[PDB]
Scaffold this active site. Structure first.
Site, PDB file in Angstrom:
ATOM      1  N   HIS A   1       0.875  -1.170   0.000  1.00  0.00           N
ATOM      2  CA  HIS A   1       0.000   0.000   0.000  1.00  0.00           C
ATOM      3  C   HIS A   1       0.914   1.222   0.000  1.00  0.00           C
ATOM      4  O   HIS A   1       0.728   2.146  -0.784  1.00  0.00           O
ATOM      5  CB  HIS A   1      -0.886   0.027   1.249  1.00  0.00           C
TER       6      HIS A   1
ATOM      7  N   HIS B   1       2.215   4.409  -3.015  1.00  0.00           N
ATOM      8  CA  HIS B   1       2.392   5.845  -2.846  1.00  0.00           C
ATOM      9  C   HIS B   1       3.754   6.204  -3.388  1.00  0.00           C
ATOM     10  O   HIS B   1       3.944   7.274  -3.969  1.00  0.00           O
ATOM     11  CB  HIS B   1       2.362   6.246  -1.374  1.00  0.00           C
TER      12      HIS B   1
ATOM     13  N   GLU C   1      -4.948   9.361  -2.357  1.00  0.00           N
ATOM     14  CA  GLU C   1      -5.091   8.392  -1.268  1.00  0.00           C
ATOM     15  C   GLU C   1      -6.191   7.398  -1.576  1.00  0.00           C
ATOM     16  O   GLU C   1      -6.036   6.192  -1.365  1.00  0.00           O
ATOM     17  CB  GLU C   1      -5.446   9.088   0.044  1.00  0.00           C
TER      18      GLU C   1
ATOM     19  N   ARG D   1      -9.759  -4.403   4.728  1.00  0.00           N
ATOM     20  CA  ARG D   1     -10.998  -3.688   5.020  1.00  0.00           C
ATOM     21  C   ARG D   1     -11.737  -3.323   3.743  1.00  0.00           C
ATOM     22  O   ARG D   1     -11.129  -3.145   2.690  1.00  0.00           O
ATOM     23  CB  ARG D   1     -10.706  -2.429   5.827  1.00  0.00           C
TER      24      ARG D   1
END
Length: 1288
Positions: free
Chosen positions: A229, A233, A267, A369
């Site tokens: 993750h 970025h 994001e 999630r």
């Protein structure tokens, strides 16, 4: 491929792959950090990230860094070389796991080859500058020989250990002189604070964590996904596309609102899933454009670059080749670099929508999630990622050899406990809101995380309000927040095969750089409110840890007052039993009872309310949380039926629905092609406008409404659990009061109890989730989409004239076509775009919600007029304005009457923003109606005069319902004035009719071909309506008798509703049975049966018969009804007001009276009037035959006669008939028989004949059990009271 290096912390510095680096934020001062090259251009520094943080801040305090995270503190992590080495080996294992698959390896290859451009915005286009903090970082070569010699190196990523908050991983970019090269197409060294062992925990809201409220719940994250993750970025920062634009900012004006930082689109792209949909197509394009403009500057530089002043050894051609592949620029045979839109496009989508946490998780079969916006649980510590028994490179925690591949069992906290450890709550910190009362006012602490996240209006782009210029050029602009992950995994020219430049270069001398400064803020914020909303209600359901003896209460206020009192939203009976104390010998029984009750109560979440057109309602949500508009007061079901989903919202957001900007078409005199092209373009751009508008709506729904409904869902899960915990507590207490001797004999199994309570909760949760999801979709469809259509329809019209006027001005240059397109423009701005959620998202959960909702016929109701507070209102949810004038009668039985007075009418102004004009005509209309009998002396006018009752017209087009005597007619009139009708005519010569003056059910359906009329579920008439063109049906609906009627003419109606689709024979049959249902019996006309009301009796098995007290005998003879005597040829019937006048009396009053309505199973007395006295119907107790004549006599109590009757209803299908049963006594199951009619033979001295009498027969007892139910049965009766609708 990618190579992962190996080494141990203790290994010697070689100045090549193991160095002493001077980090970018060290400003060229302070100490150096031993760093290890894990792969080309990627470094690992196994130490805490201290840049910008105060040393003391590594300790847990009364403060926090981030308002939305359960922050874990541990200043000792990584404070020994052995710890540093464990960190090193762990990182190596995660990288290996990452590359263990194509998708991960490619992410790494992309990152390794995505070298920051040599320079930033400050560098001249013709130059390469490596002497800036975002491009070069120094290493200390300083060995023996001038202690202090440094070499410069290029790097892409430097990964440090965690900062103050271990579980707060973050990727960081370098800003200089207020700007970031990583946000302007250049890219720049990236840094990251990461911790592999303390990972986040999450729990699927819709799902369940092993389905055990008493066991641990949720799932822990796979550190490899956490790393990827952050790597995503890094990728964005390396390619210089970590751009900033209009962010999602939370509303924080109310105390119940969740505070947090602005959330950038980048994001949300990184997380993937539904989140991208929270970024409007508008802002999607803005970002797209910004990035393109960035690559344009870069591609221009590559064409003007000539040298590198900072480093004479840099080879220009090598770098130009590298940057060319990196940015996917194309170069011609001359060496001229340019941008290839197709390639740019593919690269952009690959980076923003291809590499996402969601896509990666799905590919690596790792669970995560559901969305960026979801309650964050406390972290847990992974015991040992270095042990292949717990975590492996190939499968992570979901190891198949341990059978933990299925359902991500390896990550489930209730299953794989050997893999993690709970954290000391003493080291955790969370931002809390202390809600105080004006009282020392009592205070309640709520975790910021639990509050409602509601995006502020400022989060959404208003670019739709701006004007657009149209031209023969102008084309559509759609950015798909999607990318086929397989072609990315198979993409051959994606991963660069262009030499990677050497990392050595001139050491950095210009350390100028902006270093971020951080500081904690209070972990507690005190506010004042006397509100008792979800937070207080949930609180009232808990109890201190030092209290073990409690009692339940339905009184919220007392529960808050006493620590031994706990609030419960369950039944009054449930609450009394829960507080009941019993002998040891009866304890086991009580437990089995109250547990069972808990389950029954919890299961009331599957309550239906079909009669009000609502399939699922959870009656106790209001009492449980008092969320939204005081949902705990009054009856919740009723409150919902009236206002709907909207009453559950804690806040009604202010939507942003801009006035779509005006189009400006470019004129092209003489050019026939360009002008035509322009028009068409404007037509397509208009569609882009509809789509973008919808995208704007979806985004607001997802971040301002669906989030609120999420909190509600979570709140219910907490509520139900508190209840279980409370019962478990009470049970433990009672059990432990007993002695050991007694407990030994008490048969109890606490694990089965929890098991049963748990199962009850899961079933309740699934119901609640369905209920709430439906509400959410309902709000989107009825409260948001319509407001958008309004504006889009306006825009349309404005563009309609704009275009035709355009086609006008250019008339000449168009020649003999200005007409062809004059219409091409009309036919297009006609067909309006249907909303489809799958266009703006691909999230499976959201699609399912939408498809589910659209499959439930009841969501097709666009008008539902129901009675409330002596008035009719539209309960469809689309808010039609309903004016009920003074001449209309209304009763709480949903009956309304239209008389012959001018003020006896209803005006319904429909919602113009609903897809009703589907272009081909598709809708249904249903209602119950009671049409009075014709006046015998006015039969001529009755059959000749037609009068409208419901009229819906607009521009001489629309539909109409009318009546002519015994016929009810449905009529359509298209835009051209063409007409079609279909009708239902009932017979008016029947001895006994089933329609004249009787409530019956009507339903008219319309589809592309036919117009069908259904009566009581049965299809009665059809008409082909193919010719019929467009029919405007959303005009004003007027209910009123209109025509040449008699002043005595009237009509009764009930349940008038409209559907924007064709109901199937099946839908209609069901609706008919649903609206026919009642606890009470009906009379001949179909109205509630009443006590103390005179009635004539009708017998379904002997239509033309009636009961009359025999002159000399205490029996009732059966006679033949008299008939219409006049001479009309149009009418015939049997008199109904004849025979004895009966009256039903109630047997026991106090038991359930306070109402005159007769309910099924009631015990009654069947009396009647013999002149000035009231007599009764009796049965001699001792008959031995199959049947016998009933006994009619004065009211008295004889021990030899049964006088009590039980009114029954054995038919399961709709009927106005009812049956009368004689039982020995109200208790026994001894049935004497039913009341009917029997035929007796009588042979006397003079007369020999057959006669029927009023009887009681046992024969019926078995007949009424047959199926289908025999309506012709002689035991079926109906009561007929005098009625203004029937005169004879």
């Amino acid at each position: 491929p990618v190579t992962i290096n190996n080494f141990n912390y203790n290994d010697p510095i070689d100045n090549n792959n193991i160095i002493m680096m001077e980090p970018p934020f060290a400003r060229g001062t302070g100490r150096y950090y031993k760093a290890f090259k894990i792969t080309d251009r990627i470094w690992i520094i196994p130490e805490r990230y201290t840049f910008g943080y105060k040393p003391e801040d590594f300790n847990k305090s009364s403060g926090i860094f981030n308002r939305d995270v359960c922050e874990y503190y541990d200043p000792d992590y990584l404070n020994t070389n052995d710890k540093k080495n464990i960190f090193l080996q762990t990182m190596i294992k995660l990288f290996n796991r990452i590359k263990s698959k194509p998708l991960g390896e490619k992410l790494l290859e992309m990152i390794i080859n995505g070298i920051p451009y040599l320079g930033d915005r400050r560098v001249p286009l013709e130059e390469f500058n490596t002497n800036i903090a975002s491009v070069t970082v120094n290493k200390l070569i300083s060995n023996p020989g001038e202690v202090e010699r440094k070499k410069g190196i290029f790097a892409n990523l430097i990964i440090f250990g965690p900062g103050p908050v271990l579980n707060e991983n973050e990727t960081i970019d370098i800003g200089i002189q207020n700007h970031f090269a990583s946000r302007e197409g250049f890219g720049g060294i990236m840094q990251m604070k990461f911790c592999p062992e303390y990972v986040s925990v999450f729990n699927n809201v819709q799902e369940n964590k092993g389905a055990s409220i008493f066991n641990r719940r949720g799932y822990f994250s796979d550190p490899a996904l956490i790393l990827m993750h952050e790597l995503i970025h890094v990728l964005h920062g390396l390619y210089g596309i970590k751009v900033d634009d209009l962010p999602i900012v939370p509303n924080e004006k109310k105390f119940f609102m969740q505070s947090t930082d602005a959330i950038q689109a980048e994001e949300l792209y990184t997380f993937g899933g539904q989140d991208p949909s929270i970024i409007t197509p508008s802002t999607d394009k803005s970002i797209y454009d910004k990035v393109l403009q960035n690559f344009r500057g870069i591609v221009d530089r590559l064409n003007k670059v000539l040298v590198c002043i900072s480093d004479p050894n840099i080879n220009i051609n090598i770098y130009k080749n590298k940057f060319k592949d990196k940015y996917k620029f194309v170069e011609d045979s001359e060496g001229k670099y340019s941008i290839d839109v197709e390639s740019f496009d593919k690269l952009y989508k690959s980076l923003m929508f291809g590499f996402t946490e969601t896509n990666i998780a799905e590919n690596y079969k790792i669970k995560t999630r559901a969305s960026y916006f979801s309650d964050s649980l406390p972290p847990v510590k992974i015991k040992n990622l270095l042990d292949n028994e717990i975590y492996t490179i190939e499968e992570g925690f979901n190891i198949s050899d341990k059978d933990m591949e299925k359902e991500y069992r390896g990550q489930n906290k209730a299953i794989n406990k050997q893999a993690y450890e709970e954290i000391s709550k003493e080291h955790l910190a969370v931002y809390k809101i202390q809600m105080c009362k004006s009282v020392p006012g009592i205070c309640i602490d709520v975790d910021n995380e639990d509050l409602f996240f509601i995006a502020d209006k400022n989060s959404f782009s208003d670019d739709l309000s701006k004007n657009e210029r149209i031209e023969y050029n102008t084309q559509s602009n759609y950015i798909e927040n999607d990318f086929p992950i397989n072609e990315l995994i198979l993409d051959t020219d994606l991963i660069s095969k262009i030499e990677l430049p050497s990392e050595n270069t001139e050491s950095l001398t210009d350390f100028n750089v902006d270093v971020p400064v951080y500081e904690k803020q209070p972990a507690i914020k005190k506010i004042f409110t006397d509100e008792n909303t979800i937070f207080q209600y949930l609180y009232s359901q808990t109890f201190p840890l030092d209290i073990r003896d409690i009692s339940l209460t339905s009184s919220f206020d007392d529960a808050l007052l006493f620590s031994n009192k706990v609030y419960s939203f369950f039944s009054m009976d449930y609450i009394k039993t829960a507080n009941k104390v019993v002998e040891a010998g009866l304890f086991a029984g009580w437990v089995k009872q109250i547990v069972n009750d808990f389950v029954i109560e919890a299961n009331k979440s599957n309550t239906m309310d079909k009669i009000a057109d609502i399939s699922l309602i959870v009656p106790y949500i209001g009492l449980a949380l008092n969320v939204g508009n005081e949902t705990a007061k009054g009856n919740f079901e009723n409150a919902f039926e009236i206002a709907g989903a909207s009453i559950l919202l804690e806040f009604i957001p202010e939507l942003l629905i801009p006035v779509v900007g005006a189009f400006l078409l470019e004129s092209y005199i003489d050019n026939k092609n360009k002008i035509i092209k322009t028009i068409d373009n404007a037509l397509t751009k208009r569609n882009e406008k509809w789509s973008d508008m919808y995208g704007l709506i979806v985004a607001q729904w997802l971040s301002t409404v669906n989030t609120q409904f999420y909190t509600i869902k979570e709140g219910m899960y907490k509520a139900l659990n508190y209840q279980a915990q409370a019962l478990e507590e009470i049970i433990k207490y009672r059990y432990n009061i007993y002695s050991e001797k007694e407990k030994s004999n008490i048969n109890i199994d606490f694990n089965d109890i929890n098991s049963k309570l748990n199962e009850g909760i899961n079933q309740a949760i699934d119901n609640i989730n369905n209920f709430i999801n439906g509400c959410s979709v309902s709000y989107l469809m009825k409260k948001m989409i319509p407001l958008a259509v309004e504006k889009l329809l306006d825009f349309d019209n404005t563009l309609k004239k704009n275009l035709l006027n355009y086609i006008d001005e250019n008339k000449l240059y168009l020649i003999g076509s200005a007409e062809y397109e004059k219409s091409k423009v009309n036919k297009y701005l006609k067909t309006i775009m249907p909303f489809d959620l799958s266009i703006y998202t691909n999230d499976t959960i959201l699609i399912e919600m939408f498809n589910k909702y659209n499959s439930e016929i009841l969501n097709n109701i666009i008008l539902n007029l129901r009675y409330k507070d002596n008035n009719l209102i539209d309960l469809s949810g689309y808010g039609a304005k309903v004016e009920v004038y003074d001449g209309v009668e209304l009763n709480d039985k949903n009956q309304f009457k239209l008389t012959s007075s001018a003020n006896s009418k209803i005006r319904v102004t429909q919602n113009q923003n609903i897809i009703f004009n589907s272009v081909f005509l598709d809708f249904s209309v249903s209602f119950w109606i009671r049409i009075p009998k014709y006046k015998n002396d006015g039969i001529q006018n009755y059959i000749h005069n037609e009068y409208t009752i419901i009229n819906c017209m607009k521009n001489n087009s629309g539909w109409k319902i009318s009546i002519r005597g015994n016929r009810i007619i449905w009529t359509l009139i298209d835009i051209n004035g063409k007409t079609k009708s279909v009708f239902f005519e009932y017979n008016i010569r029947e001895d006994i009719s089933e329609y004249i003056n009787r409530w019956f059910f009507v339903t008219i359906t319309n589809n592309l071909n036919n117009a069908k009329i259904y009566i009581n579920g049965k299809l009665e008439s059809n008409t082909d309506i193919k010719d019929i063109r467009e029919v405007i049906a959303n005009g004003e609906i007027i209910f009123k008798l209109d025509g040449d009627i008699d002043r005595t003419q009237f009509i009764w109606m009930k349940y008038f509703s409209i559907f924007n689709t064709e109901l199937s024979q099946s839908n209609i049959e069901e609706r008919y049975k649903i609206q026919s249902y009642s606890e009470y019996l009906k009379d001949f006309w179909g109205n509630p049966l009443m006590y103390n009301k005179e009635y004539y009796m009708f017998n379904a098995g002997n239509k033309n018969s009636y009961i009359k007290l025999k002159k000399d005998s205490p029996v009732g003879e059966i006679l033949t009804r008299s008939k219409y005597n006049q001479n009309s040829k149009y009418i015939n019937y049997r008199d109904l007001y004849i025979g004895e006048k009966f009256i039903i009396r109630r047997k026991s009053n106090s038991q359930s009276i306070n109402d005159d309505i007769v309910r099924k199973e009631d015990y009654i007395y069947l009396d009647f009037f013999n002149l000035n006295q009231e007599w009764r119907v009796y049965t001699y107790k001792y008959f031995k035959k199959e049947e016998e004549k009933l006994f009619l006599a004065p009211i008295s109590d004889s021990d030899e006669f049964y006088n009590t009757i039980q009114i029954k209803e054995y038919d399961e299908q709709p009927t106005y008939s009812c049956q009368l049963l004689f039982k020995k006594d109200e208790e026994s199951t001894d049935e004497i028989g039913l009341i009917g009619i029997h035929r007796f033979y009588e042979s006397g001295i003079v007369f020999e004949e057959y006669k029927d009498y009023f009887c009681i027969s046992k024969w019926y007892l078995k007949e009424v059990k047959r199926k289908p139910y025999n309506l012709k049965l002689g035991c079926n009766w109906q009561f007929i009271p005098k009625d203004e609708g029937w005169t004879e």
